């Protein structure tokens, strides 16, 4: 159950090529360089994650490039305004493969609370998103959880090793949804602490 | 009709004579209440009669005489709370001649206001517990009204 991009296909994978692909995916998922992109309040929570009290640096994702060429992760953390949607599209085009997209917050997910004339209702209207984060704003640890989700998504995708040989198509794994995976524990919740307590 | 005291006993039974005395002549068939009969139970019985035998057409008498009856039932058992006598005064003020559809309810709360005016100390003795209308809901902090 994979997905081809240049189609629901199967697992394509010599046994040495599988180990080579696993090492490539391990190196790509353990070194993810986000693009410094200040849109709205969700970016404030993103840079709150980048600080000392949360330390996204532990995952190897602290480099925070100001140039789209060096970065390989686009965290759309803010509202997709109509004036900035071409800017976001151009910055995504300037990135180089492999690249991944995380929508952070309700604005980047669907437009959020701003169903208004000057706001594009979600960045997935024009940019293929890999991980969505609900929240307004999502807390910094929610951004780190989404980073880990992106890491385990990257760790089993199949990409070409070299551009001169082999299949050049990009295979993305169809992950099981987090909602269906966590339904076994979320439904079993019975009692929560009362709101009058600290 | 309104209750009267011993100071009003030396007063002739006419219409105008009882007119400025704070009562009515009525059918001129008086009834005397001694010291042994408490006025709280007497007013409770009077309002219970006037509530169960009301016609129930108009809102103030129909939905306020049971409130006064329940207040007097609480005052009988000592379950009165601060805000009951004032409720009785507000109901009596809002049950005057023309405040209701007819004059049955002004005659109903004439004994209530008379026993309030002359025997208020017998009604305050029934107020024992503080005003508790709500109960505590676990998880919601109450709004501490001042
Ligand atoms: C928004 O403010 C900023 C941050 O957040 C506080 C940063 O973390 C950063 C990131 C800084 C660093 C990762 C420290 C510099 C070290 C780097 C880039 C080493 C990585 C380079 C290689 C592996 C290439 C060899 C920047 C630039 C920044 O301006
Ligand atoms: S989702 Fe909420 S916190 Fe995030 S950019 Fe929109 S308004 Fe700001
Ligand atoms: S005041 Fe008269 S009309 Fe109104 S409900 Fe009572 S008995 Fe009926």
Coordinates of C-alpha atoms and ligand atoms in Angstrom, one line a residue:
Chain A
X1 CA 0.0 0.0 0.0
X2 CA 2.2 2.8 -1.3
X3 CA 1.6 5.8 -3.5
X4 CA 3.5 6.7 -6.7
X5 CA 4.3 10.2 -7.8
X6 CA 6.5 11.4 -10.7
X7 CA -1.3 5.3 -8.0
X8 CA -1.9 2.9 -5.1
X9 CA 1.0 0.4 -5.5
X10 CA 2.7 -2.2 -3.4
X11 CA 6.2 -2.3 -1.8
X12 CA 8.8 -2.2 -4.6
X13 CA 11.6 -3.7 -2.4
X14 CA 18.9 -6.8 -4.3
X15 CA 18.9 -7.0 -0.5
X16 CA 21.9 -4.6 -0.5
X17 CA 19.7 -1.9 -2.2
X18 CA 17.2 -2.3 0.6
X19 CA 19.9 -1.6 3.2
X20 CA 21.1 1.3 1.1
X21 CA 17.6 2.8 0.9
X22 CA 17.2 2.3 4.7
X23 CA 20.4 4.1 5.4
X24 CA 19.4 7.0 3.1
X25 CA 16.0 7.2 4.8
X26 CA 17.7 7.1 8.2
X27 CA 20.1 9.9 7.3
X28 CA 17.2 12.0 5.8
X29 CA 14.9 11.5 8.8
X30 CA 17.7 12.2 11.4
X31 CA 18.8 15.4 9.7
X32 CA 15.8 17.6 8.8
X33 CA 16.4 21.2 8.1
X34 CA 13.4 23.5 8.4
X35 CA 13.0 26.8 6.6
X36 CA 12.8 29.9 8.7
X37 CA 9.4 31.3 7.7
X38 CA 7.5 33.7 10.0
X39 CA 3.9 33.8 9.0
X40 CA 1.8 34.2 12.2
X41 CA 1.4 33.1 15.8
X42 CA 2.0 29.4 14.9
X43 CA 5.6 30.5 14.0
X44 CA 5.9 31.9 17.5
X45 CA 5.1 28.5 19.0
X46 CA 7.5 26.9 16.5
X47 CA 10.4 29.1 17.7
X48 CA 9.2 28.4 21.2
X49 CA 9.9 24.8 20.4
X50 CA 13.3 25.6 19.0
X51 CA 14.4 27.2 22.3
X52 CA 16.1 25.6 25.3
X53 CA 13.0 24.5 27.3
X54 CA 11.8 22.1 24.5
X55 CA 15.0 21.6 22.5
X56 CA 14.1 20.4 19.0
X57 CA 17.9 20.4 18.6
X58 CA 17.9 17.0 20.2
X59 CA 16.2 15.5 17.1
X60 CA 18.7 17.2 14.7
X61 CA 16.2 19.7 13.4
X62 CA 17.6 23.0 14.7
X63 CA 19.4 24.4 11.7
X64 CA 16.5 26.6 10.5
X65 CA 17.8 27.8 7.2
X66 CA 16.8 31.2 5.9
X67 CA 17.5 30.0 2.3
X68 CA 15.0 27.6 0.7
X69 CA 17.8 25.8 -1.2
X70 CA 19.4 24.5 2.0
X71 CA 16.2 23.6 3.8
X72 CA 14.3 20.5 3.1
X73 CA 11.2 21.0 5.4
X74 CA 8.6 23.7 5.0
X75 CA 6.6 24.3 8.2
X76 CA 3.7 26.4 7.0
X77 CA 3.1 27.9 10.5
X78 CA 0.5 30.6 10.0
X79 CA -2.3 31.8 7.8
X80 CA -2.2 31.5 4.1
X81 CA -3.2 35.1 3.2
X82 CA -4.0 35.8 -0.5
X83 CA -1.0 38.2 -0.9
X84 CA 1.4 35.6 0.6
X85 CA 0.1 32.5 -1.1
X86 CA 2.2 33.2 -4.2
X87 CA 5.2 33.9 -1.9
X88 CA 4.7 30.5 -0.2
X89 CA 4.3 28.8 -3.6
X90 CA 7.5 30.4 -4.9
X91 CA 9.4 29.4 -1.7
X92 CA 8.2 25.9 -2.0
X93 CA 9.3 25.8 -5.7
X94 CA 12.7 27.1 -4.7
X95 CA 13.2 24.0 -2.4
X96 CA 15.0 20.9 -3.7
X97 CA 14.0 17.3 -3.6
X98 CA 13.5 15.7 -1.1
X99 CA 11.2 18.2 0.6
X100 CA 8.3 17.7 3.1
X101 CA 5.5 20.0 4.3
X102 CA 4.0 20.3 7.7
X103 CA 0.9 22.4 8.2
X104 CA 1.0 23.9 11.7
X105 CA -2.3 25.2 13.1
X106 CA -5.9 25.4 12.0
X107 CA -5.1 28.3 9.5
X108 CA -2.5 26.2 7.6
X109 CA -4.8 23.1 7.9
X110 CA -8.1 24.5 6.6
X111 CA -8.1 28.3 7.1
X112 CA -9.2 27.8 10.7
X113 CA -11.3 30.5 12.3
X114 CA -10.6 32.8 9.3
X115 CA -13.3 31.9 6.7
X116 CA -12.7 35.4 5.3
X117 CA -12.2 37.0 1.9
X118 CA -8.5 37.6 2.3
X119 CA -7.4 34.1 3.5
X120 CA -6.8 30.9 1.5
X121 CA -8.6 28.1 3.2
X122 CA -5.7 25.8 3.8
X123 CA -2.3 25.5 2.2
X124 CA -3.2 22.1 0.8
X125 CA -5.2 23.9 -1.9
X126 CA -1.9 24.6 -3.6
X127 CA 0.9 22.7 -1.7
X128 CA 1.1 18.9 -1.0
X129 CA 1.2 18.6 2.8
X130 CA 2.8 15.7 4.5
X131 CA 1.8 16.3 8.2
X132 CA -1.1 18.3 9.6
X133 CA -1.1 19.7 13.2
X134 CA -4.4 20.7 14.7
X135 CA -4.3 23.5 17.2
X136 CA -4.5 27.3 17.5
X137 CA -1.7 27.5 18.3
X138 CA -0.4 23.9 18.6
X139 CA 1.9 23.7 21.6
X140 CA 5.6 23.3 20.9
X141 CA 5.5 19.6 21.9
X142 CA 2.7 19.1 19.4
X143 CA 5.1 20.4 16.7
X144 CA 7.8 18.0 18.0
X145 CA 5.2 15.1 17.8
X146 CA 4.4 16.1 14.2
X147 CA 8.2 16.1 13.5
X148 CA 8.4 12.6 14.9
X149 CA 5.4 11.6 12.7
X150 CA 7.3 13.1 9.7
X151 CA 10.4 11.1 10.7
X152 CA 8.6 7.8 10.8
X153 CA 6.9 8.7 7.5
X154 CA 10.3 9.4 5.9
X155 CA 11.9 6.3 7.4
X156 CA 9.9 3.9 5.2
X157 CA 9.4 5.8 2.0
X158 CA 11.2 4.7 -1.2
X159 CA 13.0 7.3 -3.2
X160 CA 15.6 6.8 -6.0
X161 CA 19.2 6.5 -4.8
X162 CA 20.8 8.1 -7.9
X163 CA 19.2 9.9 -10.8
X164 CA 21.1 8.0 -13.5
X165 CA 19.9 4.4 -12.7
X166 CA 16.8 2.7 -11.2
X167 CA 13.2 3.7 -10.9
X168 CA 13.0 7.5 -10.6
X169 CA 9.4 7.5 -9.2
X170 CA 8.9 8.6 -5.6
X171 CA 7.0 6.1 -3.4
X172 CA 5.3 7.5 -0.3
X173 CA 4.0 5.0 2.3
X174 CA 0.3 5.1 3.1
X175 CA 0.6 5.3 6.9
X176 CA -2.2 4.2 9.2
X177 CA -4.1 7.2 10.6
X178 CA -3.2 8.4 14.0
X179 CA -6.8 8.7 14.9
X180 CA -7.6 5.1 14.2
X181 CA -4.4 4.0 15.9
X182 CA -5.1 6.0 19.0
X183 CA -8.8 5.1 19.2
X184 CA -7.9 2.0 21.2
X185 CA -6.6 4.2 24.1
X186 CA -8.6 7.4 23.7
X187 CA -12.0 5.7 24.0
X188 CA -10.9 3.8 27.1
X189 CA -10.4 7.1 29.0
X190 CA -12.9 7.2 31.9
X191 CA -12.0 9.9 34.4
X192 CA -10.1 13.1 34.1
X193 CA -8.9 15.6 36.7
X194 CA -11.5 18.1 37.6
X195 CA -10.9 21.7 36.4
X196 CA -11.0 23.2 39.9
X197 CA -7.6 21.8 40.6
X198 CA -4.3 23.4 39.7
Chain B
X1 CA -60.3 40.3 55.4
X2 CA -57.4 41.7 57.4
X3 CA -56.6 40.7 60.9
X4 CA -56.8 43.3 63.7
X5 CA -55.5 43.6 67.2
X6 CA -57.0 44.6 70.6
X7 CA -56.4 48.2 69.8
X8 CA -58.8 47.9 66.9
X9 CA -61.4 46.1 68.9
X10 CA -62.8 49.5 70.2
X11 CA -64.0 50.5 66.8
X12 CA -67.6 50.3 65.4
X13 CA -68.5 47.9 62.7
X14 CA -69.4 50.0 59.8
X15 CA -68.1 50.2 56.2
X16 CA -66.2 53.5 56.4
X17 CA -65.2 52.9 60.1
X18 CA -63.2 49.8 59.1
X19 CA -62.3 51.5 55.8
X20 CA -59.5 53.6 57.3
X21 CA -58.7 50.9 60.0
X22 CA -56.7 48.9 57.5
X23 CA -59.3 46.1 57.1
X24 CA -62.8 45.5 55.7
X25 CA -66.2 45.0 57.2
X26 CA -66.8 41.9 55.1
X27 CA -69.7 39.7 56.2
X28 CA -69.4 41.1 59.8
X29 CA -69.0 37.6 61.2
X30 CA -65.7 37.9 63.1
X31 CA -63.5 35.1 64.4
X32 CA -61.1 35.4 67.3
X33 CA -57.7 33.8 67.5
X34 CA -56.3 33.3 71.0
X35 CA -52.7 33.1 72.2
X36 CA -52.5 29.3 71.9
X37 CA -53.1 29.2 68.1
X38 CA -49.9 30.3 66.3
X39 CA -50.5 32.7 63.5
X40 CA -48.0 31.0 61.2
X41 CA -50.2 27.8 61.0
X42 CA -53.3 30.0 60.7
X43 CA -52.0 32.0 57.8
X44 CA -50.7 28.8 56.2
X45 CA -54.2 27.3 56.4
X46 CA -55.8 30.5 55.0
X47 CA -53.4 30.6 52.1
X48 CA -53.8 26.9 51.5
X49 CA -57.6 27.4 51.3
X50 CA -57.2 30.4 49.0
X51 CA -54.8 28.5 46.7
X52 CA -56.7 25.2 46.4
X53 CA -59.9 27.1 45.9
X54 CA -58.6 29.7 43.5
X55 CA -59.8 29.7 39.9
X56 CA -56.4 29.7 38.3
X57 CA -57.1 32.2 35.5
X58 CA -54.5 34.8 35.9
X59 CA -50.7 34.4 36.5
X60 CA -50.0 36.2 39.8
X61 CA -52.5 34.5 42.1
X62 CA -52.3 31.1 40.3
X63 CA -48.5 30.9 40.4
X64 CA -47.8 33.0 43.5
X65 CA -50.2 31.6 46.1
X66 CA -48.5 28.2 45.9
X67 CA -45.2 30.0 46.5
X68 CA -46.6 31.7 49.6
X69 CA -48.1 28.4 50.7
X70 CA -44.8 26.6 50.4
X71 CA -43.0 29.5 52.2
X72 CA -45.5 29.2 55.0
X73 CA -45.0 25.4 55.0
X74 CA -41.3 25.9 55.4
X75 CA -41.9 28.5 58.2
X76 CA -44.1 25.9 60.0
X77 CA -41.3 23.3 60.1
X78 CA -38.6 25.8 60.8
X79 CA -37.2 25.4 57.3
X80 CA -37.5 29.2 56.5
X81 CA -34.6 30.9 54.7
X82 CA -33.6 34.6 54.4
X83 CA -35.6 35.8 51.5
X84 CA -39.0 34.4 52.4
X85 CA -40.8 37.3 54.2
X86 CA -39.6 39.7 51.6
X87 CA -41.0 37.3 49.0
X88 CA -44.3 37.5 50.8
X89 CA -44.3 41.3 50.8
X90 CA -43.4 41.4 47.1
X91 CA -46.2 38.9 46.3
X92 CA -48.7 40.9 48.4
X93 CA -47.7 44.2 46.7
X94 CA -48.0 42.6 43.3
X95 CA -51.4 41.1 44.2
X96 CA -53.4 44.3 44.9
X97 CA -56.8 45.4 43.6
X98 CA -56.5 45.4 39.8
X99 CA -53.0 43.8 39.9
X100 CA -54.9 40.5 39.5
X101 CA -57.9 39.7 37.3
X102 CA -60.4 40.0 40.1
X103 CA -60.5 40.8 43.9
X104 CA -60.2 37.2 45.2
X105 CA -56.4 37.4 45.5
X106 CA -56.3 40.8 47.3
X107 CA -58.7 39.3 49.8
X108 CA -56.4 36.2 49.8
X109 CA -53.3 38.2 50.8
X110 CA -55.0 40.6 53.1
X111 CA -54.5 38.2 56.1
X112 CA -50.9 37.6 55.0
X113 CA -50.0 41.3 55.1
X114 CA -52.0 41.8 58.3
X115 CA -50.2 39.1 60.1
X116 CA -46.9 40.5 58.7
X117 CA -47.7 44.0 60.0
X118 CA -48.9 42.9 63.4
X119 CA -47.1 39.6 64.1
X120 CA -43.8 39.8 62.2
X121 CA -41.9 38.3 65.2
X122 CA -43.8 35.1 64.9
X123 CA -42.8 34.7 61.3
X124 CA -39.0 35.4 61.7
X125 CA -38.8 32.5 64.2
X126 CA -39.2 30.0 61.4
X127 CA -36.1 31.2 59.6
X128 CA -33.3 28.8 60.7
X129 CA -31.2 27.7 57.7
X130 CA -29.3 30.0 55.4
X131 CA -30.4 30.4 51.8
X132 CA -29.2 27.4 49.8
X133 CA -30.9 27.2 46.4
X134 CA -28.1 25.4 44.5
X135 CA -26.1 22.2 45.2
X136 CA -22.4 21.8 44.6
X137 CA -21.5 20.3 41.2
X138 CA -18.2 18.4 41.2
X139 CA -15.9 20.1 38.7
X140 CA -17.6 23.5 38.5
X141 CA -16.5 26.3 40.9
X142 CA -19.5 28.2 42.1
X143 CA -19.8 32.0 41.5
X144 CA -19.6 33.4 45.0
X145 CA -22.2 36.1 44.9
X146 CA -21.8 39.0 47.4
Ligands
LIG1 C1 16.0 32.1 14.7 O1 17.3 32.1 15.4 C2 18.1 31.0 15.1 C3 17.9 29.8 15.8 O2 17.0 29.6 16.8 C4 17.3 30.2 18.1 C5 18.8 28.6 15.4 O3 18.7 27.6 16.0 C6 19.8 28.8 14.3 C7 20.6 27.6 14.0 C8 22.0 27.5 14.4 C9 22.8 26.5 14.4 C10 22.3 25.1 14.0 C11 24.2 26.5 14.8 C12 25.2 26.6 13.7 C13 25.7 25.2 13.3 C14 25.5 24.6 12.2 C15 24.6 25.1 11.1 C16 26.1 23.2 11.9 C17 25.4 22.3 10.9 C18 26.2 22.2 9.6 C19 26.5 21.1 9.0 C20 26.2 19.7 9.4 C21 27.3 21.2 7.7 C22 28.7 20.5 7.8 C23 19.8 30.0 13.6 C24 20.7 30.2 12.4 C25 19.1 31.1 14.1 O4 19.3 32.2 13.6
LIG2 S1 -4.0 28.6 13.7 FE1 -4.4 30.2 15.3 S2 -2.3 30.4 16.3 FE2 -2.0 29.5 14.3 S3 -1.7 31.2 12.8 FE3 -3.9 30.7 12.8 S4 -4.8 32.2 14.4 FE4 -2.5 32.0 14.7
LIG3 S1 -56.9 36.4 41.1 FE1 -59.1 35.7 40.6 S2 -59.0 35.5 38.3 FE2 -56.9 35.5 39.0 S3 -56.4 33.3 39.1 FE3 -56.9 34.1 41.2 S4 -59.2 33.6 41.5 FE4 -58.7 33.5 39.2

